[PDB]
């Protein structure tokens, strides 16, 4: 799924995370763990053209905090 966190307001709302780059050949995104205990990989989705934007799949209750902690270090 693409949910980075769940919105608790109404209609089942979620924050989604997307990665944008000049490229369209991307297939996965890396998120180094803030502890240095390794890296998390999540697969991306078919990009959209407006640059190139790729939504993120592979977000689950086991890695949401680690990806957030990975972007917090950034």
């Amino acid at each position, epitope marked *: 799924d693409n949910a980075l966190a769940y919105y608790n307001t109404t209609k089942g709302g979620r924050f989604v995370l997307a990665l944008l780059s000049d490229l369209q050949d991307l*297939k*996965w995104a*890396r998120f180094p*763990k803030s502890d240095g*205990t*390794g*890296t*998390i*990989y*999540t*697969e991306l989705e078919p990009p959209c053209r407006f640059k190139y934007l790729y939504f993120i*799949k*592979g*977000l*689950n209750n*086991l*890695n949401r905090g680690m990806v957030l902690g990975s972007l917090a270090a950034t």
Partner: nanobody
Amino acid sequence: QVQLQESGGGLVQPGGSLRLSCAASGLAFSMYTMGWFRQAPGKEREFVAMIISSGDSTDYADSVKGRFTISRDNGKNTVYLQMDSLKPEDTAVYYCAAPKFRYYFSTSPGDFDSWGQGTQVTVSS
């Protein structure tokens, strides 16, 4: 309920090659990123390689880049690790790793609970 049978290991001479196999049983294989880990004697399991669900993108530890090649067959629910230009440093037990959820992987041995029995790879004289 998720089983991993690994094979392909053995004893070879430096510079030789090997091809490991892991057949996975009991999971919607084509929706998982799969990968391999290795564990020398004493040292802790380390990430080797990973390959996304669809089979057409990969990532390798730097110590095996250019020498190893990971691939998969979504038909047989098998992932492969082609090992070329083997070095003694490569000696270790190799493990096939399946994560607990779809479309994601981690290089942290602690984030896994589906571990095969391994296959021994010995590169020596």
